[PDB]
Swiss-Prot record:
UniProt-recorded Gene Ontology molecular function terms: cadherin binding; endonuclease activity; endonuclease activity, active with either ribo- or deoxyribonucleic acids and producing 3'-phosphomonoesters; nuclease activity; RISC complex binding; RNA binding; RNA endonuclease activity; transcription coregulator activity
List of residues that carry Phosphothreonine: 431
Post-translational events: Phosphorylated by PIM1 in vitro.
Modified residues (N6-acetyllysine): 303
Residues included from the entire protein: 340 to 885 of 910
Key word Nucleus present: yes
Gene encoding the protein: SND1
Protein name in UniProt: Staphylococcal nuclease domain-containing protein 1
EC number(s) per entry: 3.1.31.1
Major location category of this protein: cytoplasm
GO cellular component, one term: melanosome
Residue ranges occupied by any TNase-like domain in the UniProt entry: 3-158, 187-321
């Protein structure tokens, strides 16, 4: 990093630091040289044990953060690094050894640290040795402190300390229901974006109600992120990361206006966010970082959304756009699994036989809980990627994940413990209680493919291969051995529980499928075995 540079302020980190974006595109956290933000170090706060919120509980911290935010957010500042501390001595830091790049930050001729100090919103560090590194405008900082003292400002004031009371109904369903009608009736409410969870979900501060809420953008579907929950590991939807950054760079810590239309089961309010005359839902669609949802159809913003989506789709970009390690010995470790579903593209789902009892126990517990607390028919509008419970054709409830929301009557779900898919009406869906989520029992179904064989490209040929497998192993216990991973799901070999005959090899024997050769040494023998079968077919 250079000693001097001009950079754009992306976030105000409390009262003594900011995050800037360099011309190179990199982000840097910069602390203000020779000043300390207000801190509660030295005072007892047992009354706030594990409930202390620095922004609101530290004397003058809110005032300092707001002064900096209003003056700098989204602006270009002139920076000159004065010194670097290898490890901050502050009591609370993350991590325990945290470097601090300390600089003089100026804009329009105003030294930011000097301005904070003059208002008593920061204090000047005193140095024991004249050789200690300090701000290059140190004398000006001390002059500012004299003014703060003279005028009794901020931390130098003798007046009663200003108290800040801020309610927080973030992701709280019962509390959200209490506020919904009021927020809907208020029309456009002023708010400050405090956090951005993704391209479309944010945490907002509403000054008029001195309350914090979580908010989801209406009328669109924004790409979801990665997952690595128990039994569910996958990359995020395309451009989920860029969408988040788009929203962060545009609205983080900006004053915006929001219209609340409804709320979801998680306590998130759903509505429209307006920033400097623009509609965020429309902007995301315009930049091809989200798509229009059917909920937008009855909205006055529908035309703008369609126009944006039209231009985005024409560009055909963004949302509209394997060898393995060689090993000496081949795996060979067959374990009992229960094959539940065979897919049309010759893939299949299985459950671990060893945990079958755990799934049974969970289903009894969950279904008994559902029987006691029946989901309200039609009061649930699922969001893509959300977990839920779904009522299958057998009339029983199962854990599921929403994969696509076509309309209120057509919700595409995936039964996470079995592997089958179904299109159902929202009336046959309900919320999945935390007590029965993957936090308690992992998703039980795992997707696998046959190793060493090529899935027929010819529909009729593939259908015949699938029918054979369904007939031979669907809904039966088999032995499975993981051979290797792929760009998709893992490839395995299956053996019949009794004869222990290789299921995939059998498809080769019958001439239903061709062999897919692997180059890795561990498969030297098995590839010859498969190629021989193919020859004799």
């Amino acid at each position: 990093m250079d000693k001097q540079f001009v950079a754009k302020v992306m976030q105000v980190l409390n009262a003594d630091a900011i995050v800037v974006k360099l011309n190179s595109g990199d982000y840097k956290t910069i602390h203000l040289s020779s000043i300390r933000p207000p801190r509660l170090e030295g005072e007892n706060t047992q009354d706030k044990n594990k409930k202390l919120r620095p922004l609101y509980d530290i004397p003058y911290m809110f005032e300092a953060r707001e002064f900096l935010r209003k003056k700098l957010i989204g602006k270009k500042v002139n920076v000159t690094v004065d010194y670097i501390r290898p490890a901050s001595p502050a009591t609370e830091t993350v991590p325990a050894f945290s470097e601090r790049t300390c600089a003089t930050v100026t804009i329009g001729g105003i030294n930011i640290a000097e301005a904070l100090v003059s208002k008593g919103l920061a204090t000047v560090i005193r140095y024991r040795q004249d050789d200690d590194q300090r701000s290059s405008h140190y004398d000006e900082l001390l002059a500012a402190e004299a003014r703060a003292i003279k005028n009794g400002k901020g931390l130098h004031s003798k007046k009663e300390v200003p108290i800040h009371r801020v309610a927080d109904i973030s992701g709280d369903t019962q509390k959200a229901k209490q506020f919904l009608p009021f927020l809907q009736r208020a029309g456009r409410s002023e708010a400050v974006v405090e956090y951005v969870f993704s391209g479309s979900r944010l945490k907002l501060y509403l000054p008029k109600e001195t309350c914090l809420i979580t908010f989801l953008l209406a009328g669109i579907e924004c790409p979801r992120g990665a997952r690595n929950l128990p039994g569910l590991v996958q990359e995020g939807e395309p451009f989920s990361e860029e969408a988040t950054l788009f929203t962060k760079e545009l609205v983080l810590q900006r004053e915006v206006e929001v219209e609340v239309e409804s709320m979801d089961k998680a306590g998130n309010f759903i509505g429209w966010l307006h920033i400097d005359g623009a509609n965020l839902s429309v902007l995301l669609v315009e930049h091809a970082l989200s798509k229009v949802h059917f909920t937008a159809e009855r909205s006055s913003y529908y035309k703008s959304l369609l126009s944006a989506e039209e231009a985005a789709k024409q560009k055909k970009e963004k949302v509209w756009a394997m060898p393995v390690l060689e090993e000496k010995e081949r795996s060979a470790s067959y374990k009992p699994v229960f094959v539940t579903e065979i897919t049309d593209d010759l893939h299949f789902y299985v459950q671990d036989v060893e945990t079958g009892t755990q799934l049974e126990k969970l289903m009894e517990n969950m279904r008994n809980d559902i029987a006691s607390h029946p989901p309200v028919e039609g009061s649930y509008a699922p969001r893509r990627g959300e977990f839920c419970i779904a009522k299958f054709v057998d009339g029983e409830w199962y854990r599921a994940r929403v994969e696509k929301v076509e309309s209120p009557a057509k919700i595409h779900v995936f039964y996470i413990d079995y592997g089958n898919r179904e299109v159902l009406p929202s009336t046959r869906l309900g919320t999945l209680s935390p007590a029965f989520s993957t936090r308690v029992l992992p998703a039980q179904a795992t997707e696998y493919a046959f190793a060493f064989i090529q899935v027929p490209q010819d529909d009729d040929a593939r259908t015949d291969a699938v029918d054979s497998v369904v007939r031979d192993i669907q809904n039966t216990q088999c032995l499975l051995n993981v051979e290797h991973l792929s760009a998709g799901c893992p490839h395995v070999t299956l053996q019949f529980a009794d004869s222990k005959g290789d299921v995939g090899l059998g498809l080769v024997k019958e001439g239903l499928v061709m062999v897919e050769v692997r180059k890795e040494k561990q498969f030297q023998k098995v590839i010859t075995e498969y190629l021989n079968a193919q020859e004799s077919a």
